[PDB]
RNA sequence: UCUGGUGACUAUAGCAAGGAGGUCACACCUGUUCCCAUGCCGAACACAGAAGUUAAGCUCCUUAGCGUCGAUGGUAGUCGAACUUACGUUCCGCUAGAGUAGAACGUUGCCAGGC
RNA sequence: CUGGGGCGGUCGCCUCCUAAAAGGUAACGGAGGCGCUCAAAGGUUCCCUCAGAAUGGUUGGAAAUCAUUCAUAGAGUGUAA
RNA sequence: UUAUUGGAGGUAGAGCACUGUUUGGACGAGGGGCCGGUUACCGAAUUCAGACAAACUCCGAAUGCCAAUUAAUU
């Protein structure tokens, strides 16, 4: 489709991080194991606790106070856990088009959202007392998101 | 009834050369007298514990440029 | 899209932080070490002449084998040895490159210490 | 009514008065325009009186620019005081003008109506003046 | 934030002198340091 | 485009060129393309009406000793006050 | 001369763009059995490899597009001298910053290999 | 001490400006800090490199967090400059 | 004391590359006229041109300062 000079010249994708969100933990310590809880049913690594960067006002921050989860999948993990949620999501999502028509930054970047719906497709609602959202980001090697077009519509709703 | 409330300064600290370039000079004497470094340290030059750069052994001493915009001191064995 | 630095170019940046306190004088020599994929390199430098004195390679026709790629670098240490005992088979200076103190690099180093080197 | 919004030092030197002008002497944005022969502060009361006659004799036609801000405080001690006992509390703002420094420039209507204009704001500034063009050749 | 002694076993008088605050380390602080009265280092213990 | 010069010789202290401003005359130099650095005198009153009927940018055929240069003008040093060229800067082209 | 390793030099050495190059060197690349490794990830680091590729790094050409360098001439300032009290003038030395012409797509020491 | 004296204010130490391209240099001249802290915020050996901006993305207080391109330190450096 | 060499340092002057100040003109994003939007208005960002500084500097003198020469005069 793009007729490529070498066979080594070829876009394909490099990283997928699930970094989760905030998870403003004021009194929410005991969820923040839960949400880590969470994040180690959905995927398989024990993602690393991303904290605060700084102090800022009007908000429950300080110095440390880590505030975020996230596990880079790379390799056979990647692989595996891509092929499971090209199929138990969208039959979970029942949406229109799915994810987006341009999410992209330029780059070829997924960006999808999540709001606790895909989320625990292995075990139903017993043990979840909040909602929560997931951020599943495609790094890939393309060079612009014309090309990742290309790329996005192999196993996917556009 | 007017005043002012500005009146302090602090004692002033004997800064800068002690030594000329081309001069010759003791093992142990005092080349700078910095804050900071505005001067590096480079052959048989030493640098102490407030910044100030002094003399490994005796000699005569060249101030030089060391990239763009740094100045270095070096002190060279033969009298 | 994704961008994958080259290893090299961030290898010396480590090597200049490195070399910032070590030089050979002539009485204390520098060796550095060079491993590239395949082959690993060595060579005696007096850094206040900028002359070098002495060389060991693994693509040398002299020690070519197939061996492990870490006992290929053992017959190495033990080549460079021998052309620095034919002069300054004194103290000198291990310049680690870039590289971490580990295996190959370990293993040249190890070969240089049992066959007469003083460091 | 010009001053700054806002000084990072209220108390400041006064400034240098001798010279010729550092910069901004040839008219770039009108038509005409009033050079300084001599030296002076000006304080920004002057440049409210001098704007004000200015204009009302264009009857609102072309523009007027002013190529002069009053960026400098200078202070003043109050009615009656023996000497030092500290810097005074501010007056005023002034501007300091060398010769050459243009001071208004005037665009959009003809010439003559321009040489009456900047005729009736010059006997409001404490300098000499002169009526100049738009350099060229 | 206080003035504090460190004493040796063996070492004959009390020679080092160093600083702590009490809230941060209220209990006796101990170091290996050199008394030259046996030419080695010995355990010394705030009194 | 016809314009004549006298070339100056060397070391103009501060008194003969402003001797020379209280004449008709500028400095100026000329240098580019195919010449060396010559600095020379131009009359002001002159150099006036070839511009004005040149232009701002034209080419001037003027004379330096034998040879005359195709030139143009380059730059020039103005005093506001006053109202004089002080100095003329002069580029070949060819 | 070509390639590589390693030093010296204020980017004239940089950045960007365009075009060619390879199983000799270099690198992507194959794999996680072993030393070793990731606040998670054999990505990185380390080790074991040599199926594949010049696409990228890299190297060689092309360009003055950005950055850098940059005279001559004039001007500002100023040491000394001479008149004067003018927001000064005159003489003689020194001589900027900005701007212009122009330079520039590196120069070079040591060793090994391939010539 | 004091632009008479009194009333007012100040008296030791650190850093800038005035200070006239070495150093030094006054005024009741202009601006600010100190009368500590740290058992690691010390020593050594190995790794790493920012704020900010832009662009995408559930919570989005606009910016918390995540990915991406640039970003001469503009970040940070116990405490003033 | 002078001639010749070498060096330390940031004044005068200039300049806007940082920090602050400021004048016009454009560009578009936002609120924003409306009937959510136009248009007007607002503030913020980015650019073109042009100005200011003792506690601003990408630059940077003259003079003075420190020294060394079997130099020359004292
Ligand atoms: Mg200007
Ligand atoms: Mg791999
Ligand atoms: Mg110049
Ligand atoms: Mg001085
Ligand atoms: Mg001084
Ligand atoms: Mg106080
Ligand atoms: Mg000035
Ligand atoms: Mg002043
Ligand atoms: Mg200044």
Redesign the pocket.
Known sequence: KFNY?????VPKIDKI?V??????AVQNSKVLDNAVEELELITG??????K???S?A????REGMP??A???L??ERMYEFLDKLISVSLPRVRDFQGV?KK?????G?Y?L???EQLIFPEIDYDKVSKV??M?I?I?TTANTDEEARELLANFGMP | ????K????????????K?????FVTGGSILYRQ?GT??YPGENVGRGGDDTLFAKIDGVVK?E?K???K?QVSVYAVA | ????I???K?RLK?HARV?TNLSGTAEKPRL?V?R????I?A?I?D?NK???LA?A?S?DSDIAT?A???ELATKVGEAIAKKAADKGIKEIVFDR?G??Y???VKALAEAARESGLEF | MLL??????????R??????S????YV??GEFGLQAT???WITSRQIESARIAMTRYMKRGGKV??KI?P?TPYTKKPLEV??????GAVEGWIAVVKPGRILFEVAGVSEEVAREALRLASHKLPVKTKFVKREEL | ?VNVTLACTECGDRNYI????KR??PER?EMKKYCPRLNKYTLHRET | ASLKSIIRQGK????????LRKSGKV?A?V??YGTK?V?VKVDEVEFIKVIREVGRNGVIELGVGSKTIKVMV??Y?FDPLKNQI??I?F?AIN
């Open positions: 000079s070498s066979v080594m010249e991080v970094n989760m969100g905030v998870g403003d690594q024990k993602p690393l606790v991303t605060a960067k700084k800022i009007t908000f429950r921050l505030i975020g996230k596990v880079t790379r390799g987006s999410a992209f930054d330029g780059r970047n960006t959202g999540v709001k929560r959202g951020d980001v790094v | 009834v007017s005043s002012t500005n009146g302090r300064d602090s004692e002033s600290k004997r800064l800068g050369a030594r000329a370039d081309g001069q804050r505005k001067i101030f440029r990239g763009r915009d100045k | 899209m994704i961008s994958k080259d290893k090299n961030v480590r070399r550095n060079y590239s994929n395949k082959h390199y060579q430098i850094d900028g002359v070098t060389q390679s693509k197939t492990t790629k870490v490159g590289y971490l580990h295996g190959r | 700054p919004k806002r000084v990072k030092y209220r108390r400041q030197h400034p240098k008065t001798t010279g010729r550092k910069g901004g002497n770039t944005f001599t030296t002076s620019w002013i801000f960026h023996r000497m030092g006992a500290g810097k | 934030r160093t600083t702590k605050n941060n380390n602080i | 103009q202290t501060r008194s003969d060129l402003k001797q400095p130099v240098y580019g650095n600095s380059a730059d040093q002080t100095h800067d580029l």
